[PDB]
Design a protein around this ligand. Structure first.
Ligand SMILES: [K+]
Ligand SMILES: [K+]
Ligand SMILES: [K+]
Ligand SMILES: [Mg+2]
Lengths: 153, 266, 68, 164
RNA sequence: CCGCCCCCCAAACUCCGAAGGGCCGCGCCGCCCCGCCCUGGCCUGGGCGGGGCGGGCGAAUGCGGGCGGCGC
RNA sequence: CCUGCUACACCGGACCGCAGGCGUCCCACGGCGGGCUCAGCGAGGACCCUCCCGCGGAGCAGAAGGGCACAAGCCCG
RNA sequence: AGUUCGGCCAUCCUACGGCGGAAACUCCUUAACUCGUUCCGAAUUAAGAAGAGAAGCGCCGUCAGGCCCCGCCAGUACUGCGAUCGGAGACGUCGUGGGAACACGGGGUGCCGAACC
């Protein structure tokens, strides 16, 4: 290393994606954020104010503060045998709403929906890790006959 | 012989601009500073006063930006002004003032339909008998029901002293809308006092009537060429202030919009 | 060409003793320094569909502006 | 045949490139157009050419109107209504230049003699679409002026004969 | 000078891009009401609480867990 | 103290490892608003001027990497 | 079908040929006043209605360049875990998991939302 400034080792991660330079689209400022929400951190390399350190690129956290211009996010960070809860202040161009609990809200809505419908017996609503296949018949009227081939060189 | 600038490598790396930037219809630097709002104001609507001019017409609109579009809450087009008694001269300084007055009155009457106590058209009824003086509806400062607040979005037009964009804003203020502004860029201001009589002259179309008066004096052959539509509605250049004053009163009374049912063709 | 076909493997043998390690001498099915086999190249020339550069041979265009 | 297709004279630029001769030169353009002319500064330094950098080198003025057309029938009358066939650019413009400036008119040479470029631009009605601030687009390819279209127009309006 | 082919290359070249890693989530939800106070044109929001209701334990495998003091 | 690489796609990772930089410079070379578009090729014009196309091939104090076009570059208040 | 304001930012771009216009948008006409051009009403600001589908714009076309999807390339390149497998080594092999890219051939060539005629 021998040199460890704030933006060291950032040649590729802070660069823009191919044919995606210039100003951010205006959805970056029309989204509504709320206390307790989950967010992803992704650094946009063209916006230099409130730009988080490279350690936080690609982490997921929770909103603790809603300020006039920036958001406050809590990140769990491992330090040498313990986890630390870190708090940072980041401007809007580097935050996106996160879908880490999207799958869980769809299931909770679907179980209460399928309960309301009762199909008179209640269906099994636990997730199932893929089971071994059941017994079945398959036709061998038309079967292909293959074999190893000879070396060609 | 000569190197070719548009190779297939030039095209592969080319990034297109936003569709409405390629068409030269939107500046996104100014659009970002209009719709921005503090994040502890989570989903409160924010409004813009949009004034656009074309050849043959002047448009005003009140608008709120949403995620995937923006809603027009109200709009007034100056081609409606023929019904209130203004037959010719649309897109001049007076016609821009009247159209902003139409849009402002129409919006406040739309938000006060049914409300009995302290409705937005009784509270802040605007102004009467245009003077061309400074006025600010948010000075009244009712404690419990504030004035409607909007911002002037002028787009690609130049913000010169005496542009028609600012006249249309002025008629919106005189109908009761809180639009923040200063008197600079109006006719009759000298950095040491703003004199309102000079501003009432453009408002009442006085510069138009003096041009016809002199133009008829020397070159009456051009007077037919220059103002043919004025002379076919038989409005003579001495009754404009007569004609504009009646028009404003007929606007405040019935701001409501009557929809022209229409038939198209491909 | 055919008048040299006998003596090329003798000259490749000479070069092999100047190079470290184990080397293999082989004869290819291609036509010269081109990319088609002799039989493939022969037929393509037989019907017309094969382009010619200077010392290299390509295929019919079949793409882009028709003529002009 | 079509109106909105007719060619007209867009503008005429008089350029004088050369201590106080530029002051004398500006008055000459001043008393030939009734316009304050401008002054250009030097991009580089060429001790071979004798100009430092950031310094008053040339002068020029743009003329737009029926005035432009009159000054461009006295400039040709000097050249005897004669123009090179190859003096017409790939984009519909042609130029020329005189050596003594009193060949448009006799003036007491006080202010000394000078020599100018006459560079003429033509256009059709519609070229505004590429200059206006809002909704700016390139003119269509057919609507532009080919050099063959430019020759047929000036010889009809003027009487130039194209020594080849 | 220009256009098409073509042999061969890069730790400080990359339009493409793995295996492999990393961070987060996997039970309490709905629906109507009522109270308190910076934010909005407003009869707007947002936060913290109260009630009345319907519900309800929603991947596998293993297993009890957390905090401090003094010191080598 | 700082950039790129060594470093094996989270973070971290050694050498008297590789190629280099810093102890300064600027009341404007700073803040804000408005306007404008650069490098250049091609084609023209008396012994700098004009048009056209122009994804930045320019510029942004000084290393290296990244960033930026009705601008973060240039000119004016 | 059209105009103003937008979302996503090329299936929407670039080049060259076409075809259209009742309305709409545009081009267009003018220098009294307003304000403006390192010079210039070119731009821009003001004031207008004689003329237009020549442009821009909408549409159609092209063994068009680009862009986008699919198949092939290929269980190949490379790689996690395990081996008292082979080889002087450099390197390769087998068991058990994951799995590209270039090239190549066919298809395609903006849609969604508020207000007004
Ligand atoms: K650390
Ligand atoms: K050997
Ligand atoms: K057209
Ligand atoms: Mg602005």
């Amino acid at each position: 290393t021998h040199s460890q400034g704030y933006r060291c080792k950032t040649r590729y991660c802070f660069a823009r994606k191919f044919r995606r330079h210039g100003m951010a689209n205006l959805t970056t400022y029309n989204r509504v954020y709320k206390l307790g929400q989950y967010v992803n951190i992704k650094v946009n390399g063209a916006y230099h104010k409130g730009m988080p350190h490279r350690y936080y690129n690609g982490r997921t956290g929770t909103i603790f503060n809603i300020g006039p211009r920036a958001l406050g996010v809590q990140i769990q960070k491992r330090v040498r045998g313990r986890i630390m809860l870190k708090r940072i202040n980041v401007r809007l161009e580097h935050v996106h709403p996160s879908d880490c609990r999207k799958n869980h809200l769809e299931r909770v809505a679907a179980n209460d929906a399928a309960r309301r419908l009762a199909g008179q017996p209640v269906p099994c609503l636990k997730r199932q890790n893929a089971l071994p296949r059941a017994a079945h018949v398959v036709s061998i009227a038309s079967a292909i006959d293959i074999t190893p081939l000879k070396y060609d060189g | 012989w000569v190197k070719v600038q548009k190779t297939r490598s030039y095209f592969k790396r080319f990034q297109v601009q936003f569709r409405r930037r390629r068409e030269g219809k939107t500046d996104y630097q100014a659009r970002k500073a209009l719709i921005i709002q503090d994040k502890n104001k989570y989903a409160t609507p924010r409004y813009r006063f949009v004034v656009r001019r074309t050849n043959k017409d002047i448009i005003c609109q009140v608008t709120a930006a949403e995620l995937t579009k923006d809603r027009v809450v109200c709009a007034a087009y100056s081609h409606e002004l023929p019904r209130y008694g203004i037959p010719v001269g649309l897109t001049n300084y007076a016609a821009a003032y009247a159209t902003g007055l139409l849009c402002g009155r129409r919006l406040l009457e739309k938000l006060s339909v049914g409300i009995k106590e302290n409705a937005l058209a009784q509270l802040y009824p605007g102004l009467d008998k245009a003077t061309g003086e400074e006025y600010h509806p948010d000075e009244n400062e009712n404690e419990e029901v504030h004035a409607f607040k909007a911002f002037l979005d002028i787009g690609l037009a130049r913000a010169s002293t005496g542009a028609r964009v600012f006249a249309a804003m002025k008629g919106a203020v005189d109908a009761g809308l809180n639009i923040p502004h200063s008197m600079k860029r109006f006719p009759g201001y000298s950095k040491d006092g703003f004199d309102s009589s000079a501003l009432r002259d453009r408002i009442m179309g006085k510069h138009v009537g003096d041009y016809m008066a002199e133009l008829k004096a020397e070159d009456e052959e051009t007077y037919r060429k220059r103002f043919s539509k004025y002379i076919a509605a038989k409005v003579e250049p001495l009754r404009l202030e007569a004609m504009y004053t009646k028009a404003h009163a007929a606007i405040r009374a019935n701001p409501q919009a009557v929809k022209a049912k229409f038939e198209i063709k491909k | 060409r055919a008048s040299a076909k006998d003596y090329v493997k003798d000259a490749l043998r000479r070069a092999k003793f100047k190079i470290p390690g184990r080397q293999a001498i082989v004869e290819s099915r291609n036509w010269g320094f081109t990319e088609f086999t002799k039989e493939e190249y022969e037929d393509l020339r037989e019907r017309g569909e094969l382009q010619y550069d200077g010392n290299n041979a390509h295929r019919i265009s079949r793409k882009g502006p028709l003529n002009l | 045949e079509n109106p909105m297709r007719r060619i007209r004279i867009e503008k005429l630029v008089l350029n004088i490139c050369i201590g106080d001769a530029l002051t004398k030169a500006a008055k000459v353009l001043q008393q030939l157009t009734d316009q304050e002319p401008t002054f250009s500064k030097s991009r580089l330094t060429i001790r071979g050419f004798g100009i430092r950098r950031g310094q008053k080198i040339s002068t020029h003025v743009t003329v737009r109107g029926e005035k432009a057309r009159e000054i461009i029938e006295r400039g040709l009358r000097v050249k005897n209504f004669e123009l090179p066939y190859s003096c017409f650019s790939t984009t519909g413009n042609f130029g020329f230049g005189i050596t003594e400036h009193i060949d448009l008119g006799i003036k007491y040479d006080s202010m000394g003699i000078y020599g100018m470029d006459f560079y003429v631009v033509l256009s059709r009605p519609g070229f505004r679409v590429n200059k206006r601030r809002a909704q700016q687009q390139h003119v269509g390819a057919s609507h532009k002026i080919t050099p063959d279209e430019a020759r047929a127009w000036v010889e009809r309006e003027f009487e130039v004969v194209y020594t080849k």
